[PDB]
Design a protein around this ligand. Structure first.
Ligand SMILES: [Mg+2]
Ligand SMILES: [Mg+2]
Ligand SMILES: [Mg+2]
Ligand SMILES: [Mg+2]
Ligand SMILES: [Mg+2]
Ligand SMILES: [Mg+2]
Ligand SMILES: [Mg+2]
Ligand SMILES: [Mg+2]
Ligand SMILES: [Mg+2]
Ligand SMILES: [Mg+2]
Ligand SMILES: [Mg+2]
Ligand SMILES: [Mg+2]
Ligand SMILES: [Mg+2]
Ligand SMILES: [Mg+2]
Lengths: 216, 129, 82, 83, 149, 186
RNA sequence: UAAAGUUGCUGCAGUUAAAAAGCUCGUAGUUGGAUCUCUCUCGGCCGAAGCGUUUACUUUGAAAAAA
RNA sequence: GAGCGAUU
């Protein structure tokens, strides 16, 4: 947002962030993740500045929209909490999802079945998706990450300071990124709320699946 | 103890240039250091710098442009005649198309080419390229 | 890291550094006006005093020196200068 | 670069890093050339114009590409001044 | 680092940037000089005089108020010791160590420290001879040291 | 009241001496101005039409002048048309000793009789109501210099409107470019 | 003689390949923090006279056997 | 993919 009023954060987005807990970080702080922090409260928890989070999310969306072919963007999740969100983002946007394990040599070994040449890479966690991050440095691949208070920033170009521990926060971040990308593309509009709700991106937690199965 | 101030200033500038920093703080200041930085800035290697004036020896904050490969000092300050300058140019400079040797002459502190134009020798202070 | 304005440190940055490592040196000490309840005279006392300060009028111990700062006697009030 | 006659004599002109001004070599595989889209100030949709940044692998290994990209975007007006 | 110790401490004083006397200080130069004279006649070294003035009378720096240093004021008035105070303290410490050491022959550490102290005394004496503060025949001798201070 | 070193007064000095006599007669500072005197005066044009008066006074009376400085400036600015009046001491400049220098070196030059010391003293006396808390020197890309002077915040409102005339006076006397700022706090 | 950057002034080495004294003091030696922008007189503008607190440095000039 | 390399 270049100080444009249309791109400013609204009250409903703030309420969603507060409910999902995206403003809550860890007890440890990385020395390169300190410009996105606001203040350390009692009990050692670091609080994230949501305005800078919105700015970084908009910058990441601008980077994503700039790619002509939507399939050249690869979205990768290793933890189970982000797999459904990544799949939904790929379905709604048109990117290529990699959920679960990332096979080493995917970007370098050109004789493998899963060899790919993405133009952009988006990851859910630098510390958990470190293998896809490392192979980006071999093939000139820019990277976008959803970082936390304690997260290394090597090979990370656009870092979005969110909470990547909770399932609600990860799902909300992916949903908002997809919404911003679609609105910038000129597919959905900024005048009305998006039809899909952010609960579709949350981790199922098969305990919840069993609880809902026996509801009726 | 500290016995050369220009050496420390140039070493600090070189180390900060290697790390990709945008600004360098060098203390203490000195008018020899100011002349050396002015010579470097006239050729476009550093950029503008500001002298912070405390009541004791001052400090300098120097902006960096990323154009500096190596800046160094020569110790001791050897006397250089106008006919021995080409040997120092061959020994210290990387090419004959760029690079400068800094001398203190009776006319002032200048580079080797300006000392050839003014037809004077002096003592070598350092070099940069 | 790789981008920091050395010319313009924040006010909280310069109060966290060592007094000599600041851009311009500045002491952490101050002078204060102290008054004992018994006697009305106002005495100027250095914060990091090294001697016992006695009230001239009434011979009252205003402060006792310690390792870092001088501690004022109970019931004595003080105000910083300037 | 060019001879005394002024004719340019080089195979190619390498591009320099936008963060550190260092030359990005032909075998620097950790370098990135990223584009950031420009939006219309009235509607907010994709204008079709973009701004290009290039970062060398040395800065990326330092973990300083995030701050460099942020500062470059702030300088170009993409990021809000009250970031 | 220290001249005779491996320690590399950094503790010292930092004078303020401003050299102007603060507004609240009501004392004049003459009153400060009279206080300095009275303290010197009481038998105090310039360092103690400065400490007392700082602690009690709110005189942060006499050189800022009167324009002159304590020792120069004393010399102009004539109330100055024959030998400098730091050399006096060094010689007094050497005398104390030597008096201790004669009753304790097996204290090798005392001998080592006495050697260090006498080396510092020789350094300071040579410096003061260079500046003609001492006559170019003044010598530190262990026997004479007790009478010297 | 005017005792020039060259013993040759002028019209502006005469008028300012008459104003000082009027202040002696009609104000409450009789003894002060009776004991004090000035050496010279000058007028310069700054700020695109503004005019500044410079009162060169002797050094052994500068401290006594500073006692009444504010009131005297107010009275002078009320007596004269809209101007800016500043009081500056009279410092001597001695040339740097040289190998070809003559018996003018029969005495060692005092450090106070120095170009840099005199310039610093002039800068300090020019802005007297506000203390100087910091100084910065910026060397421009073309080699030129700019002097930035930080003044006290507690006296900002008193001299905030006289900054431009200060920068004009210093340029006319010293020959350098100087700017003034008020930092927040330390 | 070069090769020998295997005598290193340019220009070498000293954790494990050869190698830093068991440790400290200390004279000589080496090295050493910021700061300071021609002249009266006497004679025909120049002539004499004092220059320079003096050096180091650098740029000139003079004297410097041929082969 | 990691090591100048034998090699892993
Ligand atoms: Mg020692
Ligand atoms: Mg101490
Ligand atoms: Mg040989
Ligand atoms: Mg060779
Ligand atoms: Mg060589
Ligand atoms: Mg060898
Ligand atoms: Mg061995
Ligand atoms: Mg050993
Ligand atoms: Mg010695
Ligand atoms: Mg020196
Ligand atoms: Mg011959
Ligand atoms: Mg011959
Ligand atoms: Mg292989
Ligand atoms: Mg290989």
């Amino acid at each position: 947002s270049g100080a444009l009023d249309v791109l400013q954060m609204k009250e409903e987005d703030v309420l969603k962030f507060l409910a999902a807990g995206t403003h809550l970080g860890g007890t440890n702080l990385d020395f390169q993740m300190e410009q996105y922090i606001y203040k350390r409260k009692s009990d050692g928890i670091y609080i994230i500045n949501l305005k800078r989070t919105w700015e970084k999310l908009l910058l990441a969306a601008r980077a994503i929209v700039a790619i002509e072919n939507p399939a050249d963007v690869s979205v990768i999740s290793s933890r189970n909490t982000g797999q459904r969100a990544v799949l939904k983002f790929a379905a709604a946007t048109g990117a290529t999802p990699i959920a679960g394990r990332f096979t080493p040599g995917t970007f370098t070994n050109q004789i493998q079945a899963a060899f790919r040449e993405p133009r952009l890479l988006v990851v859910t966690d630098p510390r958990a998706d470190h293998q896809p991050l490392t192979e980006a440095s071999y093939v000139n691949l820019p990277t976008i990450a959803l970082c936390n208070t304690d997260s290394p920033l090597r090979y990370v170009d656009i870092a979005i300071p969110c909470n990547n521990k909770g399932a609600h926060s990860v799902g909300l971040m992916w949903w908002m990124l997809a919404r911003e990308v679609l609105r910038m593309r000129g597919t959905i509009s900024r005048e009305h709320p998006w039809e899909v709700m952010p609960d579709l991106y949350f981790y199922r937690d098969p305990e919840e699946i069993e609880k809902e199965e026996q509801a009726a | 103890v500290r016995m050369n101030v220009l050496a420390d200033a140039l070493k600090s500038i070189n180390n900060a240039e290697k790390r990709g920093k945008r600004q360098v703080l060098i203390r203490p200041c000195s008018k020899v250091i100011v002349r050396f930085l002015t010579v470097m800035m006239k050729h476009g290697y550093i950029g503008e710098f500001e002298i912070i004036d405390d009541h004791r020896a001052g400090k300098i904050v120097v902006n960096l442009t990323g154009r500096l490969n190596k800046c160094g000092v020569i110790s001791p300050r050897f006397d250089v005649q106008l006919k021995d300058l080409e040997k120092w140019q061959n020994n210290l400079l990387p090419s004959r198309q760029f690079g400068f040797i800094v001398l203190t002459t009776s006319a002032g502190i200048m580079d080797h080419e300006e000392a050839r134009r003014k037809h004077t020798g002096g003592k070598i202070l350092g070099f940069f390229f | 890291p790789l981008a920091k304005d050395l010319l313009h440190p924040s006010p909280e940055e310069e109060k966290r550094k060592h007094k000599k490592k600041r851009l311009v040196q500045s002491p952490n000490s101050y002078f204060m006006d102290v008054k004992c309840p018994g006697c009305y005279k106002i005495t100027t006392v250095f914060s990091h005093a090294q001697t016992v300060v006695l009230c001239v009028g009434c011979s009252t111990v205003l402060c006792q020196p310690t390792g870092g700062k001088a501690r004022l006697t109970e019931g004595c009030s003080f105000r910083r200068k300037q | 670069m060019q001879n005394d006659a002024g004719e340019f004599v080089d195979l190619y002109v390498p591009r320099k890093c936008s963060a550190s001004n260092r030359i990005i070599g032909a075998k620097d595989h950790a370098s990135i050339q990223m584009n950031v889209a420009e939006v219309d100030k009235v509607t907010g949709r994709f204008n079709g114009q973009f701004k290009t940044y290039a970062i060398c692998g040395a800065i990326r290994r330092m973990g300083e590409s995030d701050d460099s990209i942020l500062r470059l975007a702030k300088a170009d007006g993409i990021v809000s001044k009250n970031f | 680092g220290r001249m005779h110790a491996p320690g590399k401490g950094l503790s010292q004083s930092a004078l303020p940037y401003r050299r102007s006397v603060p507004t609240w200080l009501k004392l004049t130069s003459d009153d400060v000089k009279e206080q300095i004279y009275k303290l010197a006649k009481k038998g105090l070294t310039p360092s103690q005089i400065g400490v007392i003035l700082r602690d009690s009378h709110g005189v942060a720096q006499v050189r800022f108020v009167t324009g002159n240093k304590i020792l120069r004021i004393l010399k102009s008035k004539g109330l100055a010791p024959d030998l400098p105070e730091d050399l006096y303290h060094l010689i007094k410490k050497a005398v104390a160590v030597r008096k201790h050491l004669e009753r304790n022959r097996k204290d090798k550490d005392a001998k080592f420290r006495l050697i260090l102290i006498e080396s510092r005394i020789h350094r300071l004496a040579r410096y003061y001879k260079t500046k003609r503060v001492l006559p170019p025949n003044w010598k530190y001798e262990s026997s004479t040291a007790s009478a010297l201070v | 009241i005017v005792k020039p070193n060259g013993e040759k007064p002028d019209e502006f000095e005469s008028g300012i001496s008459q104003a000082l006599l009027e202040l002696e007669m009609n104000s409450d500072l009789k003894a002060q101005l009776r004991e004090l005197n000035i050496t010279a005066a000058k007028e310069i044009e700054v700020g695109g039409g503004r005019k500044a008066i410079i009162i060169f006074v002797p050094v052994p009376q500068l401290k006594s002048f500073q006692k009444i400085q504010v009131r005297l400036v107010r009275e002078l600015e009320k007596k004269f048309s809209g101007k800016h009046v500043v009081f500056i001491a009279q410092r001597r400049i001695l040339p740097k000793p040289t190998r070809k220098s003559r018996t003018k070196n029969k005495q060692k030059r005092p450090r106070s009789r120095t170009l840099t010391a005199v310039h610093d003293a002039i800068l300090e006396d020019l802005v007297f109501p506000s203390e100087i808390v910091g100084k910065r020197i910026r060397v421009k890309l073309d080699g030129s210099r700019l002097i930035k002077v930080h003044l006290d915040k507690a006296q900002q409102n008193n001299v905030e409107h006289k900054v431009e005339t200060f920068s004009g006076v210093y340029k006319k006397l010293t020959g350098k470019d100087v700017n003034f700022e008020f930092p927040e706090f330390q």
